[PDB]
Symmetry: D2
Subunit: 349 residues, 4 copies
Amino acid sequence: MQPKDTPELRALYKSFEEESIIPLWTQLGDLMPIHPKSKAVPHVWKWSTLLRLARKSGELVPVGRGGERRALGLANPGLGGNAYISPTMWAAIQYLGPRETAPEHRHSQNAFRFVVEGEGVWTVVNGDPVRMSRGDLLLTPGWCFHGHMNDTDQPMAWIDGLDIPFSQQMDVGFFEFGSDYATPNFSRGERLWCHPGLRPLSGLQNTVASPIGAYRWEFTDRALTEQLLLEDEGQPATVAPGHAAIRYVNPTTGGDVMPTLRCEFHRLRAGTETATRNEVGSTVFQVFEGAGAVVMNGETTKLEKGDMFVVPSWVPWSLQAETQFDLFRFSDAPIMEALSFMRTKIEGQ
Amino acid sequence: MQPKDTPELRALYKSFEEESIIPLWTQLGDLMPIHPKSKAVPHVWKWSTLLRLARKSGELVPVGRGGERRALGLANPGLGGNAYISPTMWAAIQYLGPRETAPEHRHSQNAFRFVVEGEGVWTVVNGDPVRMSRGDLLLTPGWCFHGHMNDTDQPMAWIDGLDIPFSQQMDVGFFEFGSDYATPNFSRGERLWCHPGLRPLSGLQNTVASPIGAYRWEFTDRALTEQLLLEDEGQPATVAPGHAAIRYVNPTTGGDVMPTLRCEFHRLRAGTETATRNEVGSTVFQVFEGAGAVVMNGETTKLEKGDMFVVPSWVPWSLQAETQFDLFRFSDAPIMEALSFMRTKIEGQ
Amino acid sequence: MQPKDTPELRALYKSFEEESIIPLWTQLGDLMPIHPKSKAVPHVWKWSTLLRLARKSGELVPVGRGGERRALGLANPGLGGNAYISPTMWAAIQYLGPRETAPEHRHSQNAFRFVVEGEGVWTVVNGDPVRMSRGDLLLTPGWCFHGHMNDTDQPMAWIDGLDIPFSQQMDVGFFEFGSDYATPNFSRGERLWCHPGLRPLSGLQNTVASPIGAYRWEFTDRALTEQLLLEDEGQPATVAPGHAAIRYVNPTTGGDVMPTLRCEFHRLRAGTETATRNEVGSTVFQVFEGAGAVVMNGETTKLEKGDMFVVPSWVPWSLQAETQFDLFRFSDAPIMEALSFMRTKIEGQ
Amino acid sequence: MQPKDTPELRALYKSFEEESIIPLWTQLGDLMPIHPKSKAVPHVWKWSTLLRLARKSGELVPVGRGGERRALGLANPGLGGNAYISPTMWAAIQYLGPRETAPEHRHSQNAFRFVVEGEGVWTVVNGDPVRMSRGDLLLTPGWCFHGHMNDTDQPMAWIDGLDIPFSQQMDVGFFEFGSDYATPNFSRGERLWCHPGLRPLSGLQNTVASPIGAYRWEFTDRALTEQLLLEDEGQPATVAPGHAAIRYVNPTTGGDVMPTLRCEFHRLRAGTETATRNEVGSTVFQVFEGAGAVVMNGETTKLEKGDMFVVPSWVPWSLQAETQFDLFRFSDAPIMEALSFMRTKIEGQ
Ligand SMILES: [Fe+2]
Ligand SMILES: [Fe+2]
Ligand SMILES: [Fe+2]
Ligand SMILES: [Fe+2]
């Protein structure tokens, strides 16, 4: 029950408004909910829709007229018109036209670029050029200069993933503009850092983000194959039966690629059904290859190559593989884990 | 410039709305600002207003009719009607009437209670009772059961500080209800942990929040006196000339009281003027004793005993002491520092 | 069995000697023992012997003729004439005569001074003077300048504890000579750092050793009393029944006083018998007050006020209290724990 | 000067001997030296001597008659007959005959096996078999079961490196005996862990030693080539001009292979002369390929393929390359660094 509605109570409340006071006893229960109840909702975007809308944006939106920023943000229908896939993460399909380029800038917001279709584009990160091709993860960690250049007449699509919404809501955003279009097969970073178990004596200092600028498909694919093969041979490897998986890591530390974003890659055997999880924080998956479905809040959605979906905080989810089902994954878990808010419920346990 | 406004462009945009896509090239620059530009604004609340409105709430709002929740939230005028002092922090004046009590609950949100006026109330934290009096900091770290009981006919006011707005925006909130009104002079926690330099062999495990339930005024006052005294004697101690200061810490670790909130206490000699700082993240100060002013965005506001004010992200601020000027401080810095978003500009350097 | 003893085998072995080769197959099993088998043996020194020999050293050994170095090293009878209490630790009774002084030096070896009898001596540590009295722990962490001065006509005895034998065997030793006899009641370090739960904003950097120069008896005694009192009240506190105990810690970190040495203080209720432990590494106890015994390798030795004893690596030990039994303790455990060699067996578990 | 040599002084000293007391004032200065002065001396072993003595041991010392332990320990001439290369490290040339095997054991002492000549031997580590060939580093971290099996009629030589002397002097040694001769091309460990930048979701827990059982030559060689190539292109990479180098690391952490031993591999361009270093702790190098010399204490020794040498604590050293000069390196630095005893002087700086 509320206080008696009296002229004195109404005078009290008008003083409140005047003095920027909001009394706790008037607040709606879910200021402190029983468990996380996001304004973001579970949502799927179909690739066939996204690619068609991206191609059209290629025609209608040239460089000089918005073409420098040709990226289709996935907007969660529960987040009020904000171009946010979740309360922490921005995810967009960047569509880079034949021969297009972008100049250098840096920003405090952390970012990756996961290559969906195409080849022969380079993203240049602190002057070091990083070739892009299908299945590759590129990082452009916060405060690193990044521009790019298409070396080809072909378009490319990648997922443009950032902590923009966290950074916007929390007031951490900074931004600077920057000041040869070399096309090396591999970046300096990779040439130093992508030898397993080995660390240059010139890079003995730990870093906050990975110095690996590209995690190439070859290696991702090979790691996942080896886990399934080790499973066949009776050896521990996979995380769950038929479920091979890796986390992309900062090799100086063994932890996440960047302070705010975790990236992983999963492969499921045909037939695999994962146990239902509730996890704090939001995650986004993209179907890289294969066919299957997701269950979110008990609702099953079938999924095809390229489809993308978001699980907001604490929404119970699982995946079923119809064929071999390869998925790229990102989430805000490093944030929940750094601050001791992370929590996990699994149907098995 | 934007793409040509054509029937095809308008069809593209209507497909966007239908498919929950928001194109980057339509977005307003400050999705990624040049430096943090908060929606929260610098604001001061006068104690004499807050105490008068609190007393009236005591009369008008009894237990059974909202009295269990008698706390006046400081609402930032730039945060849209949300009861948030800043985008990360909730700060409220809790007004506890003669003999009032509250039962036990726990929530994932972290919290402290800093005692402004009054005595002989106990907050009971995981069954351990913590006496409260003026100048004391109490913690109720996340997921710890806490209720309270006034043992007296006198009211008490404290600052009720939490990471509610971070927790609400980020989807990390959990909440449980709980299931003798002992009145020990000191808590078990204090009796184990408040011997300088000494650690019980039964508490060798590090914790995520401090096991000290109260940081009593005596010690705070004594530490600040010693720094000014060491300054008089030519010995390094104070942070800046005439500026004594402490941070409240988790003694198992030496770091912050809780994962999301930093607390500190400052004492300035009469005459002291601090150098202008820009810092990422928001901070709140309360004047504990003395007289002076603040400068925020170049605007000077005079301050009296009890006044409270907020500096949102990157707003340049400094303090001037007219008399000896004691201030309690909290901020979301452990969040900015954990995620490598923290940044500092000082006018000296 | 060994290789055939042939002229060719003997020629092989003479080539070995010539070329500084020692073949594994000739080595005695205990190059890699089944469990630690120290050359150091369990040993007790009686205080009444040590004090009598110390007094005589006071008469016979004046300043100018060895008096600057008047310290009686406890030499383990199994360590070959080396002045080592154990393979890692040096422990000596320093006997400081009326009005004696020592000038400043520093060395990489870490050291403490635990005051057995006497008062009004100061050890000056990086120019900061630290009063000494019975029951106090002083640190002189490695590479810190330290000299001292007796301000009185009375002698003082303290335990002079160092990692000298580790440092000597491992080749880490460095040593420098240094370049007012102030007598403050408390040191600068203490005045900054001995306020429970509080950390100066001017000392936000973690250190490798404690910045607390003295851990005074008052606080040690009070902590131990509180644990026994909390035990009386049914509250968890003591490590084992009737067994109160603390660890001295570096307050910036919550870990050990210095990188190589751990210090602790135990109080046992009359009647308390501890469960038998095997622990890797050596430890030394001193009886501060009370009466009881120790069991080492099944052999019981009765103990009086001032007695000192060493438990080398893996020797099973326990303590029995006849009266209330207060003991100071040091060990090389931070070394075994840092390098993942630590191991513990308890008779309970 | 010493105390007066009196009958009373002699009685004092006889009481000392009786009571296991050694007085400080009688001790020789270098109990606490000015800088490290090892009993170990700089020493070189020639490969042509070591291989010839190893072959002869193959003839004279069969299995059943010492052949199970056919390893030639490098004994430092200053370490008193102890089979120690330095005060912390044991280094031996293990010579494994045609078709020989060894059963499983484990010990707390940490160990590696760096393959000098030969192929088709497997060391089986916790049931997982690790093929061995020239240039490969294998680990058998402490407390891991390890046996081996030669699958061939050819002998193999490897460097058998351990922290035996530290473990022996410090009392940390434990040892257990253990209870198909599979010959996989690659180990399970490698198949999980040797994909650059990728970490199995099933191995998210950090470990104290590397889970990589072999660091194969291919990758080592490729990393060193890339650094010299990046040097040619004007890009930062090498540690010093013409000096390419890597550290072998634990991929869960980015730190050293094991708690007590660091391993590295250096490649110098023909002509390269390194600046003189003093470093705390001992190191051992082996010439893998090429020709050059070392300078230790100002004394130059020419070096050929296979030669091995030790630099004890603080001995100034440098390397000159005549040809391209590849060297494998191990040291006790993780011990000096963990305990804050490490120190470095370089002639450049
Ligand atoms: Fe960008
Ligand atoms: Fe609460
Ligand atoms: Fe000393
Ligand atoms: Fe072994």
